[PDB]
Structure formats: C-alpha cells, structure tokens
C-alpha cells in the first residue's frame, strides 16, 4: 500500500507506506494523505529519498553510500527531519 504526502507548494509525493513509517511523526499522523504546511517540495522530495535510502541500507552488510545534502537545503532539511523525527 502507498501513501500520499503533500508539500506546502502542493506537490504530491507517493511512497510505499513502509518507507513513510520511517518517520515517527508520520506513524502518528496516520485518506492515507498528509499535508505538510511548513515543508516545501525541494525539502519533502529529499525526505522521501531519505526514506528509500534508510529502508534499503538498514541492516545491509554491503558497504553503504553517504547520504548527500546540498548546503542550500541543509538547514531546511534539519528542521524537517527534526519535525518528522527520523
């Protein structure tokens, strides 16, 4: 089952439910929709990337790649990550 997440700018981000639960505050908040009034697309897109990554590389005995964060979005993302608890 997937779920829809929505930016402040109204972009709609559809990710596997299992990946979204990576956030503690998207466990709570969970029709199968979530608005983030304070989180824009460029941030929320990146957050969904984090979900894909976390799930893929958690418990992986593979060597693991760095998660990239451009300086321009780093503050915004800290805030978002903080808010989502993930």
């Amino acid at each position: 089952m997937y779920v829809k997440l929505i930016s402040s700018d109204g972009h709609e981000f559809i990710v596997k439910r299992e990946h979204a639960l990576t956030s503690g505050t998207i466990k709570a908040m969970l029709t199968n929709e979530v608005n983030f009034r304070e989180i824009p697309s460029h941030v929320l897109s990146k957050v969904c990337m984090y979900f894909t990554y976390k799930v893929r590389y958690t418990n992986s005995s593979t060597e693991i790649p760095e998660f990239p964060i451009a300086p321009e979005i780093a503050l915004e993302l800290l805030m978002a990550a903080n808010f989502l608890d993930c």
């Binding site: 700018d9 559809i14 990710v15 990946h19 460029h42 990337m49 894909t52 300086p71």
Partner: protein, 104 residues
Amino acid sequence: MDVFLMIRRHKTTIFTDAKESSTVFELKRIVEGILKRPPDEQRLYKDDQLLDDGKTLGECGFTSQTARPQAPATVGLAFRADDTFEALCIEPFSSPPELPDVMK
C-alpha cells in the same frame, strides 16, 4: 539489480524501485497499481525521449548507479484523455533560499 525512480507527472511524484532487466510495460503496470490508469493511456520518458514499451529500464539507460535510492532517476509520465496524449509536463520543485552568509 535494483534501480530507484521518481515517476513524475505535473505535480505528482512516485517513489518506487524496480529491476534493471524490467520492461517499460512492467513499469506502466505499477503506475496503474497507483494512479488507476491503464498502460495504454501512459507514455513514459527518460528526459524527453519517449520510452519504447518493450525495452528494459536497463536498455533505456537506467542503471544500478545513476538511479540510486538517495539520488533516484526521473521517469516522466503523460496520460491520454479522449484519444490525445498530453505533452509531458513536470512542474519543478520549490527553490531553497539564498545560502546564509554564516554558511559560506
């Protein structure tokens, strides 16, 4: 081996994975699983390049690298209503503000 993808239409973005040896028609069957539209109403694009239906994602140019979970490749999607396809349209994301001075 897995490739990680953002399937994008207008202001809509699907985060999903799939095999490199998986066909483009397979990808449409997933898209159907979500937007509920049938594959015959769906064109998919690498850039502006329309993707031949019976190619593998592999063949189209998506690979274990360049389509990574933390940097997933983009597949453009366009639908058909009443026998004409729309032009591939992907609304870009917001912009981050000017970098703080304290961060130079």
